[PDB]
Amino acid sequence: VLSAADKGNVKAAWGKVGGHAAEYGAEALERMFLSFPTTKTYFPHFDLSHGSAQVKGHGAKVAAALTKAVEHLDDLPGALSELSDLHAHKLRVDPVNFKLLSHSLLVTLASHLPSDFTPAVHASLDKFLANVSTVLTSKYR
């Protein structure tokens, strides 16, 4: 559960992300696939080569969803309903993979925003991604 401070922290960080959300989305996926190659098994139809345009388009979609989540921190289950349907009912993604992606995203954000990525922002973003991951892996409709 996010504090008021957590939600303020998440917004402030995503505000610093700004127009680069798509790029960071792409890089987080790239790092996930490279560091944790068993994740690539959910993407057998993807071109997963280095710099693949397909990964970049998918990273943009992943970042737009998170941008959506940040505007609805008080009702993630309502905002993410359709994505839970996809990741929990259809794809049946093991939760461990959400931890791998969440970590890849913290790595990406920390590398690009060294002055904003304070320890408290890091703490808040980790809780936020865990919360998102819980929604996306839960069957609740």
Partner 1 sequence: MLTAEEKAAVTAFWGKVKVDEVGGEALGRLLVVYPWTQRFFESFGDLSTADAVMNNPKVKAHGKKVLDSFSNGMKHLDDLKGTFAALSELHCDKLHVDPENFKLLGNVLVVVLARNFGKEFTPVLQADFQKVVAGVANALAHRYH
Residues in the annotated binding site for heme b: 87
Contacting residues for 124 by C-beta, under 8 A, at least 6 apart = 2, 5, 6, 7, 9, 10, 13
- Gap between the Cα atoms of 45 and 141, Å rounded: 28
C-beta closer to its own copies: residue 39 or 84: 84
The label of the residue with tokens 């280095």 reads: 50
- Gap between the Cα atoms of 61 and 111, Å rounded: 21
7 binds, among its own copies, ligand HEM, partner 1, none (CB under 5 to 8 A by kind): none
Q: Binding site membership for O2: which residues?
A: 58
Determine which residue in the list 17, 31, 79, 131 makes contact with partner 1, applying CB under 8 A: 31
C-beta closer to its own copies: residue 42 or 140: 140
1 binds, among partner 1, its own copies, ligand HEM, none (CB under 5 to 8 A by kind): its own copies
Greatest CA span in the chain, whole angstroms?
41
- Gap between the Cα atoms of 128 and 9, Å rounded: 10
Contact set with partner 1 (CB under 8 A): 27, 30-31, 34-36, 38, 41, 88, 91-96, 103, 106-108, 110-112, 114, 117-120, 122-123, 126, 137, 139
